[PDB]
Amino acid sequence: TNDVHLSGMSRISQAVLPAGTGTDGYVVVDATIVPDLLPRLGHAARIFQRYAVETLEFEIQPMCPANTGGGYVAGFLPDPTDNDHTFDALQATRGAVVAKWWESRTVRPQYTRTLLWTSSGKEQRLTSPGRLILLCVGNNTDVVNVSVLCRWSVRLSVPSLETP
Amino acid sequence: TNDVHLSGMSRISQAVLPAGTGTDGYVVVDATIVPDLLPRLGHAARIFQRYAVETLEFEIQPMCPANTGGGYVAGFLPDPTDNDHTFDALQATRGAVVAKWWESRTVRPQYTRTLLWTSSGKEQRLTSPGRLILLCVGNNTDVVNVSVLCRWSVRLSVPSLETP
Amino acid sequence: TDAPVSKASTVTGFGRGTNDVHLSGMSRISQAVLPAGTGTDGYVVVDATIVPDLLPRLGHAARIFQRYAVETLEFEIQPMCPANTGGGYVAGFLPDPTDNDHTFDALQATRGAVVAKWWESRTVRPQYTRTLLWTSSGKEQRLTSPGRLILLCVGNNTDVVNVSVLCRWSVRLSVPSLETP
Amino acid sequence: TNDVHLSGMSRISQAVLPAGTGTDGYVVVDATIVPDLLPRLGHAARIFQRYAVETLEFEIQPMCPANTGGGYVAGFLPDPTDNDHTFDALQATRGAVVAKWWESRTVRPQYTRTLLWTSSGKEQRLTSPGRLILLCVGNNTDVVNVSVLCRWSVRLSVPSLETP
Amino acid sequence: TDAPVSKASTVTGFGRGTNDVHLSGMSRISQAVLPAGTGTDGYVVVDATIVPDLLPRLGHAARIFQRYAVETLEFEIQPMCPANTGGGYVAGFLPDPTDNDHTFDALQATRGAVVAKWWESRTVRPQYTRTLLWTSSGKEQRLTSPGRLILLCVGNNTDVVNVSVLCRWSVRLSVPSLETP
Ligand SMILES: [Ca+2]
Ligand SMILES: [Ca+2]
Ligand SMILES: [Ca+2]
Ligand SMILES: [Ca+2]
Ligand SMILES: [Ca+2]
């Protein structure tokens, strides 16, 4: 048919959290997972109309001095409209992880296996499988550079060219 | 999987219509059927993101003297965005009933079986299967204590804590 | 193929719409609230000419059709007054829209007329014309409406009566068009 | 695997030949068929490294009055390095067509089915299946608006983002 | 029939030429005359890149075709010197046109290489690429030529040697065109 199964890895966000401001509940990476964020999927969505996320797995890859004594929590809220940035909301979601700033982690969430829309629109629940939230649980002694890699396996369909 | 199946009866609305304030077309209960209204299902959906109604059967218990004069009509619009609160909408829809103020009737409605969302959004078309309306046909004589009990049976999924 | 001066038109499917819809349903043609003591013998509670405009969901469907034929027509008087009220009502269907006589005898003559007390419901199964009737209005209304429902008070009423006249229509529209108000 | 199959029609070139400027042998469209020219396939190949043409069928739509005087000849050299832009090359190759300025013809060419590259290189012999030429046979009378639409069907591989 | 504004073109047989010719033959790719005493070890007697231009009768045929595939290639070294001359020759076919190494070991490594004395003839049955190669030149010559024949003096020659390198090519041209110099 018209379906194409693409996959790859991408860096949705990279943030330099300064030393001393790593207070609990402070959002570090609060990103909405739309095809725009992923570069290869960004190019591939412009030539299609409806996609479905078959597999989505994030990786937190902090790069900090070992003297850093803080921690992070990572989660994937499957509701793009959600504006809650509390620890309990993250931890309740499937696949949420808690770790120290010197340990990379993997988040395996529960994405909705439905046919979404590549393009943007008025309602975000039809255009984004969810949104990733990372909170700095503990105060960090040193500046921490955090990178949130993503591994996606979408199924594009309904061929059509579009514009940003 | 995560196909939590729940069922049970719950009072969506308790209304006290005063005597002599039953002008025809007066709306007694105008409730958008979201999981938050149902007590047990409210707690259930506070820890889930998606639900899908599998069996919905409202039943009306008015506690009134058998000699009271008046009547009630009940219906369930399968479109939450509809704001029409007249007898025409109720008589048009399927499963609507009309009865005397002392009778108990079951409003077996036509609802959607897709996967809706347990939280608010821009449109209610993905958050609630419809809207229940109860209108006071004729002028009541005594005081009316009506209670609408909802026999619901939904299936939840996508575990995630939520805050109202 | 050659290049002609002007090529032939290629509109094939023009004026080939559907000419048969068996629309049916139930609707309230009249709602009345009689104050106590005003139900004098002969008072006209309901005087409704059965036209497609009167029926709400049938009006829009008849707007896009020329002729309709009533296949099944039934009325159901449903008073909502208590069982302690005194008086009677009579309900009937005059098959002549131009008739303006409003008396108990006139209704009683017609087939299917019902006489009852106000605390009891009745169904008026009438005699209507099966022929095709035009949807739109005209000089003579006898080509547009099967008849007129009339509901009278047989006797003086004691309490306040809230009657409701329901109709179960079943038409078969044809001759497609886009009739306009 | 990574055998993304795509297909569709796309206008490689829109040309406006002025009236009275149709000297015989004038080249209207001289396009090397790289994926960049095709709009949808351009976006597709910006996120891939190798493609392999599986079905290539150009079709010419000139919008001209039926009474115009002149003609067009079209061909597809399967060698991108060829710089000959004369009628001899077109009449030699397979699938070439000649017609009046108001007629639509399909240039069914002889192309290579190997795996080419989506980016530039020292030689075009591994980056494009060939070169399309459209020549103005005879002198045009009116103004000519020619559009060449390419029915393409390629298979991409080796995912990698590229910048033009 | 009617008279159209402009009649349709009637060119039917356009761009339908033959795309398969199995041209074959034999030709001399190099003729050398070595003066006595100059056949020092390692001297390059023959260094010939096998291209359609080099083969005389194949050049014109490849001028009217795009891609050719070598189906059978064989070389025959035929010295014409007497039997009283001392020294040896080595002949081989490097399958890489860009290779410029000219040593005895390089030829000896390849399959089909021959080493002989000057008063004796040998046939070089080489290993060539069966794939389709473009007739015309380009940026990379590895898509245009199967390889390069190299003939060296193994040892110092005593008399004057007149060697002659013959090639038995057998190609299969395709993808018709009118390629130009
Ligand atoms: Ca779109
Ligand atoms: Ca939510
Ligand atoms: Ca009419
Ligand atoms: Ca590249
Ligand atoms: Ca060439």
From TrEMBL, chains A, B, D:
Top-level taxon in the UniProt lineage: Viruses
Location relative to the cell: Virion
Entry protein name: Capsid protein alpha
Family indicated by similarity: Belongs to the peptidase A6 family.
Organism per entry: Dragon grouper nervous necrosis virus
Binding site for Ca(2+): Q49, D79, D82, S119, E162
Bilayer-spanning residue ranges: none
